[PDB]
Amino acid sequence: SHMDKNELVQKAKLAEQAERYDDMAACMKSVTEQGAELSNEERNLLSVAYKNVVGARRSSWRVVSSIEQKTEAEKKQQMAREYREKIETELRDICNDVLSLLEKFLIPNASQAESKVFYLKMKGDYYRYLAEVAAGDDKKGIVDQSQQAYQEAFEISKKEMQPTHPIRLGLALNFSVFYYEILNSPEKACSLAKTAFDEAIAELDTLYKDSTLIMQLLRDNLTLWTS
Amino acid sequence: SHMDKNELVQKAKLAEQAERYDDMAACMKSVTEQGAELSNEERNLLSVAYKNVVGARRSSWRVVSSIEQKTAEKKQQMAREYREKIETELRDICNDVLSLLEKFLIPNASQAESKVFYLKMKGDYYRYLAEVAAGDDKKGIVDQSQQAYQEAFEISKKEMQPTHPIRLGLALNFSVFYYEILNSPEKACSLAKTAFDEAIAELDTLSEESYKDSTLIMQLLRDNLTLWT
Amino acid sequence: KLSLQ
Amino acid sequence: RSLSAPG
C-alpha cells in the first residue's frame, strides 16, 4: 500500500551486479524495515552488502591508523588523525544502522534456530567493529554487547546445530577472534578455536566445501596465535 | 596566503592509500585550482584518482546498460532509471576534470610532454562523455574528443620519441576513439599499427625509466589490433 | 586475524 | 571492448 518490497529487492540485486554497495545496502535496509521475515536470499543480500560497505571503512581505518602511528612529524599526524576520525564516523553510522535492524527487526522476528544464530553472530560482529574504534569510556560497554551477543549465539548453536555447520563454525571463528583481538585473551581464543575445530573434524565424514573453508581459517588463526 | 597546497597533496596520497578515490579527487581538484603548474607526481595523482572515480561509474553504467537491453516492461524501467542516475554522476565527474583541463592545466603547461598528457586526457574525458551521450548532444561531444586527441597527436609527432609511453598512450586511446566511437576500423588499425611499428623500430634505444610503460602499451596496441582484425 | 567470509 | 591506456 505504502511501498514496494519486491522492487526494492530487485534494485538491491541490480545494485549488487553494478558493484554499488551503498545503493545495495540502502535497498536492503528499506526491505528489512517493512518488518517481514527475510528469506535466505534477502538475508544474504543484506549481509553481503553491509559486509562490503563496512569492510571498506574498516580497511581504510586500518591503513590510515597505521600511518598515524608510524608518524609519531606533528602536523602531518594531525591530518591523518582528523582523516581517521572522518572514517570512524562513517563506520559508526553503518554499524548503528545494522545493529538497529538486527535488534529491532531481524532478531525478534527470526523463527528458526539457524537464523537466530546467524543474526546474533552478526550482532556481535558489528558491536565488535564498533569496539575496534571505541574511545576509552564507551569501549567497555560496547565490548560487553559484542560478547553477550556472541555468547547467546554460541549456546544456541551448541544445543541446536551440528559442529560441522558453517554458521556454527563462522560463529566459533568470529567469537575466538573477538577474544583474541578485543579482549586480548589468547588462551580463551585458541581453546575456543581448537575445540570447535576438533569437533568439526570428528564428523568430517558425514558431509563440505563451505565448512572446510572456515575450518582452514580456524586453523591458520590457531597457527598465527601460537607464536 | 589563503590555503595550503602541500597539505592537499599529502591528503590526496593518504586518500589514495586508504583507497578513497572520491576523497582523493577532491584534493587534487582543489590543488589544480591553486593555478600553479603540477609536478609530475601531482599530475599522476590527478589522473589516477579521476581514473578510478570515473572508471567505477563507466563499469557500472555498462553492467546496468546491458541488463537494460537484455530485457519485461517494469524491470526495464528500473534499469533505465538506475542507468540515468549513474550517467549524471558520470557527467559531473567528466565536467569537473574537463574544466580543470581547459581552464587551469592545459594553458599553463609549459613543456610539450605535459601539453600532450593533458590534451590526451581532454579527449579521454570527452570520449567518456560520448560513451553515454544521448542523440542530439553526441555529435559535438565526439568532435571535442577528436580535436583534443588530434592536437595532442600532432604535438607528440613533432616533439616526442615514438617509443615514449605518453605518445604511445595517446596513439592507443586515439585509435580506440576511432574504433569505439566513430566506428571507423580502418583508421583505427592504421593508427595503431603505424604507432606500433615506429616504436619497435627504436626499441633498441629504450631507457630503464620508460621501458615497462612503453612495452605494456605496445602489448595493448597489439592485443587491440588482433581483436579488431 | 581471520573472520568469516 | 577495446583496451585503453592505464594510469
Q: Where are the domains of chain A?
A: 1-227
Mutate one of C1, C4, C5 to test the A interface: name it (highest A CB count within 10 A).
C4
**Which one-letter amino acid corresponds to residue B224?**
N
Let me know: does B176 contact B224? Beta carbons within 8 Å: yes
Q: Which residues contact B91 (CB under 8 A, 6 or more apart)?
A: B129, B132
Question: What distance in Å separates residue D3's CA from the closest CA in chain B?
Answer: 7
Give the closest of A121, A125, A221 to C2, CB-based.
Answer: A221
Kind plus residue range of the DSSP H or E element containing A8: helix A5-17
Kind plus residue range of the DSSP H or E element containing B5: helix B5-17
CA-closest candidate to residue A62, choices A137, A126, A130, A132: A132
Let me know: does B104 contact B35? Beta carbons within 8 Å: yes
- Residue A158's φ and ψ, nearest 5 degrees, are -55, -40
- Residue A193's φ and ψ, nearest 5 degrees, are -55, -55
Distance from chain centroid for Cα A211: 18
Cα gap B168→A226, rounded to integer Å = 53
Q: Is D in contact with C (3 or more beta carbon pairs below 8 Å)?
A: no
Cα gap B16→B10, rounded to integer Å = 10
Chain D contact residues (CB < 8 Å to B): 1-7
- If one looks up domain B1-229 in CATH, what number appears? 1.20.190.20
Residue A221 touches chain C, beta carbons under 8 Å: yes
Let me know: does A170 contact A214? Beta carbons within 8 Å: yes
The cell numbers describing B225, all together, are: 589490433
Tell me if B20 and A60 make a contact (CB, 8 A cut-off): yes
Method: X-ray
Q: Which residues contact B202 (CB under 8 A, 6 or more apart)?
A: B161, B162, B163
Residues shown for chain B: 229
Give the closest of A121, A125, A217 to C2, CB-based.
Answer: A217
Resolution in A: 2.4
Kind plus residue range of the DSSP H or E element containing A139: helix A136-160
Residue position matching grid coordinates 556454527: A168
Tell me if A17 and B79 make a contact (CB, 8 A cut-off): no
Tell me if A87 and B17 make a contact (CB, 8 A cut-off): no
SS3 (DSSP) at B71:
coil
| Domain A1-227 class in CATH | mainly alpha
Which burial class, exposed, middle or buried, applies to A210 when counting CB atoms under 10 A from its CB (0-12, 13-18, 19+)?
middle
SS3 (DSSP) at C1:
coil
CA-closest candidate to residue A177, choices A218, A223, A126: A218
Residue A186 touches chain C, beta carbons under 8 Å: no
How large is the C-alpha radius of gyration of chain C? 5
Which burial class, exposed, middle or buried, applies to D5 when counting CB atoms under 10 A from its CB (0-12, 13-18, 19+)?
buried
Let me know: does A149 contact A127? Beta carbons within 8 Å: yes
Give the closest of B44, B48, B172 to D4, CB-based.
Answer: B172
Give the closest of D4, D6, D7 to B176, CB-based.
Answer: D4
